[PDB]
Amino acid sequence: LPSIQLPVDYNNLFNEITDFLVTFKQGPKYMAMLQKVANRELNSVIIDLDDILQYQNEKFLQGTQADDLVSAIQQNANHFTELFCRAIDNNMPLPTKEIDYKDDVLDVILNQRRLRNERMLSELFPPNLTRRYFLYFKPLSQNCAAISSKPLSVRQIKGDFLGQLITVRGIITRVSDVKPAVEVIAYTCDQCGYEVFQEVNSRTFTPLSECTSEECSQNQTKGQLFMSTRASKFSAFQECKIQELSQQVPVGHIPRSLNIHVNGTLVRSLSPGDIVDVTGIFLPAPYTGFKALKAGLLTETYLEAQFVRQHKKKFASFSLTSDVEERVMELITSGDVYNRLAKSIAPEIYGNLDVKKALLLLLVGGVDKRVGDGMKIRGDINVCLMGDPGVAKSQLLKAICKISPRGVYTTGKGSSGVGLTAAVMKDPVTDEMILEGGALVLADNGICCIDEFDKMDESDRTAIHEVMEQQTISISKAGINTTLNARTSILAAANPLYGRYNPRLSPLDNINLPAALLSRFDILFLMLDIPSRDDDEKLAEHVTYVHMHNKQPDLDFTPVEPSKMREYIAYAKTKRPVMSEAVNDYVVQAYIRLRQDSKREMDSKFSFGQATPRTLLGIIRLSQALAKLRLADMVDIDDVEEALRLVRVSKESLYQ
Amino acid sequence: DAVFGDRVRRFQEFLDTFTSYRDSVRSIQVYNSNNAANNILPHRIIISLDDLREFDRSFWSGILVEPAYFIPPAEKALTDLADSMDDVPHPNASAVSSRHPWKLSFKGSFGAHALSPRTLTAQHLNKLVSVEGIVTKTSLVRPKLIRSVHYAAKTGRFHYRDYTDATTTLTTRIPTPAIYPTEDTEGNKLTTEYGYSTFIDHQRITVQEMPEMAPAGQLPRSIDVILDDDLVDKTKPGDRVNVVGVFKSLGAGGMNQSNSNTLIGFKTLILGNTVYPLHAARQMLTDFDIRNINKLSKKKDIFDILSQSLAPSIYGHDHIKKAILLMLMGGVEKNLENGSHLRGDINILMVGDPSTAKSQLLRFVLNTASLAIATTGRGSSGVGLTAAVTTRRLEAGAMVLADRGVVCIDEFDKMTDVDRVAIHEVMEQQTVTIAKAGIHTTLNARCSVIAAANPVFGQYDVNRDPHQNIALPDSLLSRFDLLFVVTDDINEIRDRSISEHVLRTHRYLPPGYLEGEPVPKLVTIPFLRKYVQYAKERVIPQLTQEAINVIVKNYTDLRNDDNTKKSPITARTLETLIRLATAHAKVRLSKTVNKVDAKVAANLLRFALLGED
Amino acid sequence: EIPELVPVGEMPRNLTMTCDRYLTNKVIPGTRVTIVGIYSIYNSGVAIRTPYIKILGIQSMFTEEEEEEFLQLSRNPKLYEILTNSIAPSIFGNEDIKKAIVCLLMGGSKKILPDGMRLRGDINVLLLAKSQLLKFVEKVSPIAVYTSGKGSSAAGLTASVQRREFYLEGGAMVLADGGVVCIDEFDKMRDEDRVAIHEAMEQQTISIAKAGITTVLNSRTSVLAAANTTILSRFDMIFIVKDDHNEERDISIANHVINIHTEISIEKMKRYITYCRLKCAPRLSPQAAEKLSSNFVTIRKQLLINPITIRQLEAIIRITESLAKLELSPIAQERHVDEAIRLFQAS
DNA sequence: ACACACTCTCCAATTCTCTAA
DNA sequence: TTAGAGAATTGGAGAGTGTGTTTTTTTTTTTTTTT
Numbered sequence A: 001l002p003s004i005q006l007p008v009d010y011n012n013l014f015n016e017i018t019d020f021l022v023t024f025k026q027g028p029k030y031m032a033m034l035q036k037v038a039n040r041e042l043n044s045v046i047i048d049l050d051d052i053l054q055y056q057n058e059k060f061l062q063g064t065q066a067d068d069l070v071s072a073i074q075q076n077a078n079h080f081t082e083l084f085c086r087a088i089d090n091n092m093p094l095p096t097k098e099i100d101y102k103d104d105v106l107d108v109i110l111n112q113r114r115l116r117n118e119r120m121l122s123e124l125f126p127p128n129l130t131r132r133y134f135l136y137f138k139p140l141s142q143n144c145a146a147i148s149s150k151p152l153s154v155r156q157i158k159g160d161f162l163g164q165l166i167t168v169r170g171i172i173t174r175v176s177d178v179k180p181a182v183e184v185i186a187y188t189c190d191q192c193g194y195e196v197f198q199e200v201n202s203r204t205f206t207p208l209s210e211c212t213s214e215e216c217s218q219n220q221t222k223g224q225l226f227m228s229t230r231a232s233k234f235s236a237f238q239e240c241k242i243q244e245l246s247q248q249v250p251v252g253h254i255p256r257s258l259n260i261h262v263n264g265t266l267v268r269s270l271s272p273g274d275i276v277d278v279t280g281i282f283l284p285a286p287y288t289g290f291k292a293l294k295a296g297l298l299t300e301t302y303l304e305a306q307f308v309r310q311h312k313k314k315f316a317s318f319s320l321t322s323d324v325e326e327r328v329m330e331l332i333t334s335g336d337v338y339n340r341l342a343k344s345i346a347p348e349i350y351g352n353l354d355v356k357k358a359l360l361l362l363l364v365g366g367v368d369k370r371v372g373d374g375m376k377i378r379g380d381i382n383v384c385l386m387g388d389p390g391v392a393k394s395q396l397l398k399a400i401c402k403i404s405p406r407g408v409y410t411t412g413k414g415s416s417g418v419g420l421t422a423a424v425m426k427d428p429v430t431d432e433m434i435l436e437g438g439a440l441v442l443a444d445n446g447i448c449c450i451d452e453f454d455k456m457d458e459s460d461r462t463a464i465h466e467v468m469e470q471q472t473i474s475i476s477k478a479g480i481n482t483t484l485n486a487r488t489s490i491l492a493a494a495n496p497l498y499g500r501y502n503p504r505l506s507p508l509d510n511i512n513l514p515a516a517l518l519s520r521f522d523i524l525f526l527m528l529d530i531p532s533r534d535d536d537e538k539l540a541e542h543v544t545y546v547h548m549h550n551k552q553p554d555l556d557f558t559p560v561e562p563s564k565m566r567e568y569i570a571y572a573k574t575k576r577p578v579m580s581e582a583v584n585d586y587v588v589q590a591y592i593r594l595r596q597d598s599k600r601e602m603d604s605k606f607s608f609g610q611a612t613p614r615t616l617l618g619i620i621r622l623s624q625a626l627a628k629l630r631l632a633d634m635v636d637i638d639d640v641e642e643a644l645r646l647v648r649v650s651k652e653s654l655y656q
Numbered sequence B: 001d002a003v004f005g006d007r008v009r010r011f012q013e014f015l016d017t018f019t020s021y022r023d024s025v026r027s028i029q030v031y032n033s034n035n036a037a038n039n040i041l042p043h044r045i046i047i048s049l050d051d052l053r054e055f056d057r058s059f060w061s062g063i064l065v066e067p068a069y070f071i072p073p074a075e076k077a078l079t080d081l082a083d084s085m086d087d088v089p090h091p092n093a094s095a096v097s098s099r100h101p102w103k104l105s106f107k108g109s110f111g112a113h114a115l116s117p118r119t120l121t122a123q124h125l126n127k128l129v130s131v132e133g134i135v136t137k138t139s140l141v142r143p144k145l146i147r148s149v150h151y152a153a154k155t156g157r158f159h160y161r162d163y164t165d166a167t168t169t170l171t172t173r174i175p176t177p178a179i180y181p182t183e184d185t186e187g188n189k190l191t192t193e194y195g196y197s198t199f200i201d202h203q204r205i206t207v208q209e210m211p212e213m214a215p216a217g218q219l220p221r222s223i224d225v226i227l228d229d230d231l232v233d234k235t236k237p238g239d240r241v242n243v244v245g246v247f248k249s250l251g252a253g254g255m256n257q258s259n260s261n262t263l264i265g266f267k268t269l270i271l272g273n274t275v276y277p278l279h280a281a282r283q284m285l286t287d288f289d290i291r292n293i294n295k296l297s298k299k300k301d302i303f304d305i306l307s308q309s310l311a312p313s314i315y316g317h318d319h320i321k322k323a324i325l326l327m328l329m330g331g332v333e334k335n336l337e338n339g340s341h342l343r344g345d346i347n348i349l350m351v352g353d354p355s356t357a358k359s360q361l362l363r364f365v366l367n368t369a370s371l372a373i374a375t376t377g378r379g380s381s382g383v384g385l386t387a388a389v390t391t392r393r394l395e396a397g398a399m400v401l402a403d404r405g406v407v408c409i410d411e412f413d414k415m416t417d418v419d420r421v422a423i424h425e426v427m428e429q430q431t432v433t434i435a436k437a438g439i440h441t442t443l444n445a446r447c448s449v450i451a452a453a454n455p456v457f458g459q460y461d462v463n464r465d466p467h468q469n470i471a472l473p474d475s476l477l478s479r480f481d482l483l484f485v486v487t488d489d490i491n492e493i494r495d496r497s498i499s500e501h502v503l504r505t506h507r508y509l510p511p512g513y514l515e516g517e518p519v520p521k522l523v524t525i526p527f528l529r530k531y532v533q534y535a536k537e538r539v540i541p542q543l544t545q546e547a548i549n550v551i552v553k554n555y556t557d558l559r560n561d562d563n564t565k566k567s568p569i570t571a572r573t574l575e576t577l578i579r580l581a582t583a584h585a586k587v588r589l590s591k592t593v594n595k596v597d598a599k600v601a602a603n604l605l606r607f608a609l610l611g612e613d
Numbered sequence C: 001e002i003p004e005l006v007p008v009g010e011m012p013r014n015l016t017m018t019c020d021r022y023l024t025n026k027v028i029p030g031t032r033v034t035i036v037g038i039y040s041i042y043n044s045g046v047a048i049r050t051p052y053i054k055i056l057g058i059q060s061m062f063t064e065e066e067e068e069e070f071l072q073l074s075r076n077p078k079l080y081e082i083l084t085n086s087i088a089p090s091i092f093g094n095e096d097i098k099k100a101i102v103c104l105l106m107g108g109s110k111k112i113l114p115d116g117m118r119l120r121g122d123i124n125v126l127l128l129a130k131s132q133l134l135k136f137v138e139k140v141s142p143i144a145v146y147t148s149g150k151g152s153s154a155a156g157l158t159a160s161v162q163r164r165e166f167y168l169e170g171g172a173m174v175l176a177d178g179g180v181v182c183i184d185e186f187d188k189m190r191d192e193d194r195v196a197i198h199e200a201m202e203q204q205t206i207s208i209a210k211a212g213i214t215t216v217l218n219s220r221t222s223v224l225a226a227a228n229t230t231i232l233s234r235f236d237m238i239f240i241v242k243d244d245h246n247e248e249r250d251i252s253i254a255n256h257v258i259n260i261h262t263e264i265s266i267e268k269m270k271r272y273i274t275y276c277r278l279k280c281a282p283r284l285s286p287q288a289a290e291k292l293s294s295n296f297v298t299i300r301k302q303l304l305i306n307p308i309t310i311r312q313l314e315a316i317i318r319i320t321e322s323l324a325k326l327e328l329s330p331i332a333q334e335r336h337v338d339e340a341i342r343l344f345q346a347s
Numbered sequence D: 001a002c003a004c005a006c007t008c009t010c011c012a013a014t015t016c017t018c019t020a021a
Numbered sequence E: 001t002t003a004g005a006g007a008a009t010t011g012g013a014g015a016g017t018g019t020g021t022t023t024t025t026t027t028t029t030t031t032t033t034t035t
C-alpha cells in the first residue's frame, strides 16, 4: 500500500548495460560471444565484474560521472539477470552462417501462428520461450578488490545476506542426479485448432483447462485443451548440499550446511568430497497455497549457483596451454629435475633423500596394461615405511598428503575394515538398504595414507587385499550385490615388533607381516635410529635453524614451489613410455639372480622372504615411472639400473 | 493513544539527564562509521534499572509491571536520540529502509521478580522477570520475514509492506498471512526486491532448574525462551545462564473449538531481552594488575617464587613443581608456509611408590588451569577418550573437549593396551581421525597431558632395569617430555620434617570462624592465574644464536655419551629442550630466549633423565 | 486404590483428577490421602466418555529442652563406655569393634586450605555374628544404605554404562552420598568395582569417560564392610569378629523368639549423633602434634632397624578428632591421642 | 484462501398456436 | 398456402453458498561396553 523513495533508477543502469555490452574491450569483447550465440555455437554467457569495474574507471578517467553498477548488481543481484537478458535480446546480431532452421519445432509453430494472424488480419508469446542461452555473473577478483571476493564459512551466512551475491567455502556432502524442470508449457485446443502457452516460476502450478482465446470465445467454441511436450521448454536441474570444514567447527557445536541449486550448462560440476569455493545468489523459498496461510513468517532458504572454483586441479583436468608450457620449459632447461623435485618434498626434514625419491615415484606411478584377451595388470605403486620411533615417519607421510590432488589420511586404530572399504547401511527411516563407499573409494585415482599400520587389527587388514592388487571392491550382502572401482595407491607406516628394532632376531621376525600382504608392497623401506655424534650435531643445527626462522637453511638449493611441482607431475602422467628388447633382456636376467639368491639364503639372518613374480613387475613399474619423469617415450637401461638401486638401498639399514 | 507521546517525552528527559547513555550511543556510532570506510557493533544499550528508579518512580514501576505499555515508547525515544545525532550521508538502497531501530537491555535490583523455573507461576504473567538455570536444548537458527519491498514495472514507484507474528511484538495485533503481493492496487504487475527487504534471525532454547535444587528426586521443571537478532547462538547446551525478559502467554488454549473440553492450559514463554552467563574459566585484568605483573617480573629469582607458590601444602618435590609451571606456560606453536606443523605443548609423566603425593599433586593442576579435564585410566575407553560414532553424527571424547587446555590422567597403569594406542596420534599430531561405516572426518585436540602411574612390582626396584619396572613401550615413553621417578625412602630427619609439616597443615582455621566451629614470600593463586594468563597472551619469545649454541652441544653429548639413562633419547629430545627454554623465557616476560633459559632447561632435563644433579 | 482393599490376584485400579489455585502443589507421590470432590466425565466405541474427579478438599532442628539432655550426656565421665555398651547389646564381647563403630558414626573434621586442597572427614572400617552389626549400624545412623557385593543393578557398587543410545547409572556408592553405606559381603564385589572403589574411597569421586559420556560423580561417604590382599590398604581400621558359646545366651534368644512368635535407646542416640555432627568440629592442640610426630618417627625407626606411611598418620588424626567430638571439646588432647593409637592396633 | 461440489434463480431461445391475405 | 403476431415451455448462464486442506515385534549390518 505505501511507497518510498530510493537512490537507484533502473533506466540509467539499463543504459549503462547496453553501452557496456557494445563498447568494452580488453572488436568489443561481448559481441564476439553474441555472434557465437547467434550462430548456435555457444550456449552460455559469463559476465566478468572485473570488466565493469575497469569500464567504470575508464569512463571516470575520461572526465564523466557514472553509476557504480558493480555494487548495484552485488547488492540486489536477482533483478539484473533480467536486465542483461533484455539488453542481449535487443542487441543480438544476425547469424554469420547457415543454420538449418527447419530443425526447430518452435520456429515452425511460431511461423505458422504468425501466418494465422496475418490471414486473420486480412505480446504474442513469452520471450523466455526463445532464449537459446544461459547467463551467469563471475565475482570480483580479490586482488582488484568487496564481499563477493571474500569467502564465508557456512556459519557466517546470516539473514542479512538474503538477495545478495556471495562466495562460500566448504565440502560437498551429497549430489542429486539430473531431472528436467518446466519453464514454459504449451497446449493445443482441439475444436478451433489454436495454441496457448503458460509460464511456470513457483514449485507447483495448475494446468489450464479452457480455451479463453477471444476468437474461440466469440465463435462460442468451448473447446478442450491438451498438453504437449514437443513444443514445451525445459531446463536441466540438479540439487546439492555443502557443509563447513571440520577444522573450522567451534568446540561443542554440530556442523551446519546449505542447499545449492544448479541450472543450465553449469550442471554436474560439483561432486561429493570436493573442497570448493562456490559463489552464487542467496535467496528465500516461499510457500504456496493453503500451506502459506499457516506456515508463519519463518522462511526456508538456498543458494543459486553462478560459478565454481576448485582448490586443487585434478590430474584429469590438465591441458598444455602455452602458459603451462612456458613454466615446464623452466624445469626442462634447468635440468636434473629428478633430484630437484625429490629434494623439494618437505624441505623442513633433513636428509632421508632416498625415501623422498621413492615417494616421488609413488606420486608418478607406472603404466596401466590391458591384454587382448581381457586380462589387466595393476599400474599403481604401493609403498611402506618400517622404522624406529622418532624418525619423522608420520611427519613425512602427512607432508605428501598436501601435494596429491586427491588423497586421504587415516590411522590404524581409528579405522574399521568396513569404513575403510565400503559399508551397507540401513540408513533411511524407510528401512531401505544403501551402499556407501569408504576411504579407499574416496581415494579413487589418488593416494591413501595409513598411519599406525601395525596397530590395526589382523582381521580388518585383510579387507585391503582385494583393493591393493585388483583395484576393485566386491560386496554381496542383504539386498546389495555389486562391484565398485578403487584405483588407489596405498602408502603405510609402522614400528617393528616390540617398538624399537631388535637386532637379536631376523628382519622377518621384526617386520611381523604375513607373506601375502608383504608381497603387495612394491617397496618396503627399513629405517633405523642409530646414534652418531657427527650426524646428530648436523641434524640439530638444521632443526634449530628452522625453529628460529620458519625457513629451511639454504646456501645452494632453492626448492620448486608445490604449484609448479604439480604442473610438472601432471604433465608427466600422460606419456606411456614403452619397453624395448635390449631392456627386456637385462631385466629378465636380473630376475633370475634375485630368485636364486633368495633360495640360497631362506635360512639366513639376512633373509627377507622369497622373491615372487610380483617382484618382476615391481621393477617394470619403477622403471616406467623414472621414464615418465624425464618426459621420454621409451624406457632406457639407465632407468632400470636406478630402479634396481632404489630397491637395494632399502635393506642397507640392517648393516649399521 | 495520546499517552504514548507523553511516555516518549518522559524517557527523552531521562536520556538527557543521565548523560552516560549518550556517550554509549555516540561511541557505537562513530566506531561503526569508521570501519565502514575500510566486526560491526550491535545497535543495543544496557540501562541500569536503579537510575530509572531514582529519576522517576512512576516510570520505573511501569517498566517493571506493565512492560508491554512502557518498553516500546522508551525504545522509540532511544532511536530518536541516535537518529538526531550526526550520521554518514548518502545511504544505500538497503540502508534507507532497513526497519532497524535501537534496542534496550537491563541490569540491577529486580527484587521480588528474580526467580527460577520451579517457582515461575501464573501470577507473574505479563511481568518483566529474571530466571536462572541450565540450557538443555537449542533450535537451529532460522531467518524470519518482517518487511518486503516491491518495484512497480510501469509507474516506476517502489512499494513496501510489513508483517507481524505473536512472538515479534510485545503488544498484540491481527496476524499476517505471509503472502507476497503480485499485483498493484492499480493493476500493475509487481516484482519483489530481495536485498531491500528485511529478514531477522530467530532461535528457541530451553532452560531447566539446576540439579542442585531438585527436591526429593522429583521431576525437574523447565521453560522455553525466544531469542532474535543479536542474541542468537550466544549459548550452547550445559551452560549455566541468567535470562531477563517478559513472561507471556500464547494461542487459543482450546477455546477455539476442540475435543479437550478445555481442560488443557494456554502456552507460555519468556521473550529474551538480555542474557548473562554464570561462572560456576577467564579473568579480565585491571590497570593495577599490569603494573604489578611487570614490576614483579624484574626480581632476581621469579621462577623460584612462583614455583614454590604452587601447592604449598605439599612438602618437597621442587623439580616437579617447576616442571608443572613450565607446562602451564608452554612453548610456541609453529605453522610453516608449506602447511607443515611443529608441536608446542609439553607432556609430563610421573611414576612412583604408594602414598607419595602423586594423586594429590596431580589434583592441584585441575584447580589452577583455565581449562582442565580429569579422568582415571581404567574408567575410560579409547573411543571415549578420543571420539565415538552415534545417531551419522560423530561425538567428541575427553581429549577433543580439552582442546587448548590440560588433561589429567590418574591410575595410568590400569589402562588396557587396546585403550593406550588410541592416544599415540593425539600427543604428536594433535588431531583425531575416524574412518568408520558412513563417516570420515578429522578433529583438533591440541592439549597437554599430565599423568601418574604405579611401577610394575608395586614399589620401584632399583635392582632391576627401568624397562622392567616401567611396562610401557618405547614409542609411548618417547612422547612424554619429562619422566619423573619418585620413592618413599625411609630416613629419620625426612620423616620428622614431613610429619611436622602435615601436622602444621591440619591445624589451619579459616578466617571467619571460632575454634571448633564447623566450616621468603608466596604470591596468592588468584594473582598467579592472572600472571600465567597475561604471560601466555602478551609475550611470544623468539629464539637466539646464544641459546642455540647451548642446545646443540647438550643434545649431541646427552645422546652419544653412554650412561644408565631412564628414557630413550631421540629427535624428540631436542624439541623438548627448545620447548623448555622457550617456556622459561616466557616466565621471565622476555621478548627473546637467552643463554640463561637454555642453561636452566638443560639442568632440568638432566635431573629428570639421568637422575642426579 | 488402597493396597489392603484390592481383591486377590488383581492389580490395583486408579483414577485421574484435577485441582486449582490453593489446592495445587500440596501433596507429593507415595502419600496416602483422603479426597472430597465432584465425580464427573469428560471427552477424549459409541456414546462413551472417560471419568475423573474435581477436587474440593484434601487431607493427608532441636528445641532447648532437647539439647539440655545432650549437654548433660556430654559431661558424663563415662560417656564413651555408655555409647559402646548401647551398640548391638545382644552381641557378646567384641569391645573394640563397638568402639570403632562409634568412631565411624561420629567421624573426623573436614578442612579446606588457601591453596584449595581439601582434607577428608569420613572414616572407613572392615570386619573379618557379623551380619547383625551392619543392620544395627543401618538403624542407628542418620542416613544409611545396605547392600550385598553384587549390587542392586548392573551399576554394581560404583557405576557403569549401559545400552539404542548409551546411558549411565550409579550404584550404591553414589546413592549413599552424604551418609553411611554398609556392604554385606565385600568379597562378592564385581571386577569393575574392584578397580573403581580406589577412586571412590581416596578421592570421594567416581569419574567416567566412555562411549561419549564424560562426567564425574560425588561419593562423599563413610564405608563399613565385611568379608569371610592389597585392598585392605584403603581402610582406616580392620578387625576380625570373635565368638563365644554360652548356652544361656542362645536360650535367652530362643525365649525371646518364642515371646514374639506367641545405656541409650536408638532414637535418642541417633538424635545425639546428629546434634554432635552439627555443633562441633574440633582441632589438635600443640601437645598432640609433638606426641603424634614423635610416635610416627619412633615406629618408622623401629621398623627400619628390624610400613607406616603418611596416609596412615592422616587416619590416626581423623580418629583422634572423632574421639574428642563426643565430649564436645573444641580442642583434642593427649587423652584422645593415647586412645587413638591404642585403638589403632588392627594387625 | 484457494479449488471444488452443489443449489438456486432469471432470462431468452425455441416451438406451438391463431389469424388474415 | 404463406407468413407474422402472441403465448407457453425449457436450458443453462452464471451467480451464489458451503465445504476441506497443514501436521511389539521380526530380520540384518555395525559399533560399543560388558564378562
Ligand SMILES: Nc1ncnc2c1ncn2[C@@H]1O[C@H](COP(=O)(O)OP(=O)(O)NP(=O)(O)O)[C@@H](O)[C@H]1O
Binding pocket: A348, A349, A350, A351, A352, A387, A388, A389, A390, A391, A392, A393, A394, A395, A396, A494, A495, A539, A543, B343, B428, B475, B571, B572, B575
Ligand atoms: N631428519 C629430521 N629432520 C627434521 N625433524 C626430524 C627429523 N627426524 C626426526 N625429526 C623430528 O621428529 C619428531 C617426531 O616425528 P614423527 O613423524 O612424529 O615421528 P614418527 O616417525 O612418526 N615416530 P612414531 O610415530 O613414534 O613411530 C618431529 O618433530 C620431527 O621434527
Ligand SMILES: Nc1ncnc2c1ncn2[C@@H]1O[C@H](COP(=O)(O)OP(=O)(O)NP(=O)(O)O)[C@@H](O)[C@H]1O
Binding pocket: B313, B314, B315, B316, B353, B354, B355, B356, B357, B358, B359, B360, B361, B454, B498, B502, C202, C310, C311, C314
Ligand atoms: N608432603 C607429603 N608427602 C607425601 N604425602 C603427603 C604429603 N602431604 C600430604 N600427604 C598425604 O599423602 C596421602 C596420599 O597422597 P596421594 O597423592 O593419594 O598419594 P599417591 O601417590 O596418589 N598414592 P597412591 O594413591 O597409592 O598411588 C594423602 O592423604 C595426602 O594428604
Ligand SMILES: [Mg+2]
Binding pocket: A393, A394, A395
Ligand atoms: Mg608417527
Ligand SMILES: [Mg+2]
Binding pocket: B355, B358, B359, B360, C202
Ligand atoms: Mg593417591
Ligand SMILES: [Zn+2]
Binding pocket: A189, A190, A191, A192, A193, A194, A211, A213, A216, A221, A223
Ligand atoms: Zn479454442
